[model samples]
Target: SSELVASILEAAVQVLAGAQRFTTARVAERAGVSIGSLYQYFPNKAAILFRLQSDEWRRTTRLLGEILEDTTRPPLERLRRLVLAFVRSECEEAAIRVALSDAAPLYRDADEAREVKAEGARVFQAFLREALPEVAEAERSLAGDLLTTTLGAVGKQFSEQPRSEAEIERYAEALADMLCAYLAALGER
Candidate 1:
């Protein structure tokens, strides 16, 4: 039963990767199943994509959680680890990277994409809120938003190229430097 579900899900993703559109009939064709069979499990193509993205996020967060579990690490080190983990996570799913790049143009119109982006923001928000203990309450929120937005922009930049281990470390260090500097400045104000 699990294999069958995985097969159907992979088929759905394959269709989207190729066509860049979500349609039940297209997914059914990719799955080599009738449209009725596809509908038996997924109500629509959006449902299939939602399931795919949810699974992706779950796995990604698990990886991140494990990477960040060492509370002995300093906040700057933790932030660097998190950034490295994110870069590693993106490499695990080329489809997601492709989907993200395509979806960028649709950010103006796609509510689903917008929600996903916001959820991503919330993840970084929680992380920063925990990491920066000394930040003022009002400034903590701004710091998280700035860190999230900056990291998103950096991730998009690296996504376009072939990522190497060195590239990952460099980006991670740069992120940590930026965040630390920003927090330091915030402290002086």
Candidate 2:
């Protein structure tokens, strides 16, 4: 069972690496398994994608958790580091990011994507609860939503555009400054 799961996940990575329209047969072939075997676990491509997205979220959430936990810096500096780390993660998985973004046209799995975004929002809400509890509950939720949506949209741009290292750094820094200022303004009340 573990092998099957591993194979499916690896196949997703491989398929996403090269193609836009991901399919179960292609994933099965790339995973060195029969089509039946692929279907034995995942009934369709979206199921596999759901798993892929789930795995990615777990890894990302854990990394964000570690950074939020271990860093002993000011809130603003910590936020900057968090954004930079997020940008690095997005760049590292540029292929998958591109694939996911491009897949939007073929399969408008908006519900699944919203679930993923909500998970991100919850994670950041927990962070803000710790770092900036003085913020109103509604304002904190809005902040979390804005942060998740902004990062998701901007990350897609970074994935699609072939920017230089300087450009990437500039974009991430500006994003951090903007998010920090927004948070500060929200907390000013």
Candidate 3:
């Protein structure tokens, strides 16, 4: 039943917070659900982890749209704000995120994530366009890919350890400067 699913999800969060690991017995035990009941909704531990991972991305995409469209702020400031908030939150959730990498195999479950990233890319690239109007549009396209790939990779990598406030801000500002510093210096076509 759906109630059993909720129990398992909630239990999974608690288990991961301490274990920083996802073990099937830990989930079912804390959830007070038997292995049979748990499998009714989730095929395996991987499926449960994927459920939480997808939910994490869903919330993040909402926040991305929210902050990226707050046009009252200048585009560069918008991106800086995005970096600070994202890096900070990612640090807090590093436990789940770190564990999630183990749960997902080499390949991602691509279809829905593709649509989410596609929508995010639309706003993300436009942010670059506004910030780098003096830079050639063709070149800004490459910047978007380079900057985004590095930011995502670096963000997830540092999150292997839940870092302190100072460290998180320090790394975020360093990367934010990396993104905007040279970006502000380019010329148009």
Best by TM-score: 3
At residue 2, candidate 1 shows an lDDT of 73
Ranking by lDDT: 3, 2, 1
The residue-by-residue lDDT of candidate 2 on 1-189, one tens digit each, is 898889788978877765466778888998999999888898877677667766776777776666666547766787787788788666646655455555544655456657666767777888788768888788888888888789878876676645556777888899999999988887787
User: How badly does each model clash, as a count of residue pairs?
Assistant: 0, 0, 0
Where model 2 places Cα greater than 4 Å from the true spot, the runs are 1-56, 97-112
Better of 1 and 2 by TM-score: 2
* Deviation (Å) of 160 in candidate 3: 3.2
Candidate 3, residues 1-189, lDDT tens digits: the string is: 667777898888778764345788889999988888787888787788777777777777887778888889987787887887777656655766556567665745547656866776677788877677777777888887776677667776887775878999999998888877767765433
Whole-structure CA lDDT of model 3 = 0.75
- lDDT (Cα, tens digit) per residue for candidate 1, span 65-156: 55555578866677777777776555444555455446443433345445655766676666666676677767788887887777667765
Deviation of model 3 at 96, angstroms: 4.7
Q: Report, for every candidate in turn, its global Cα lDDT versus the true structure.
A: 0.67, 0.74, 0.75
lDDT of 2 at 2: 90
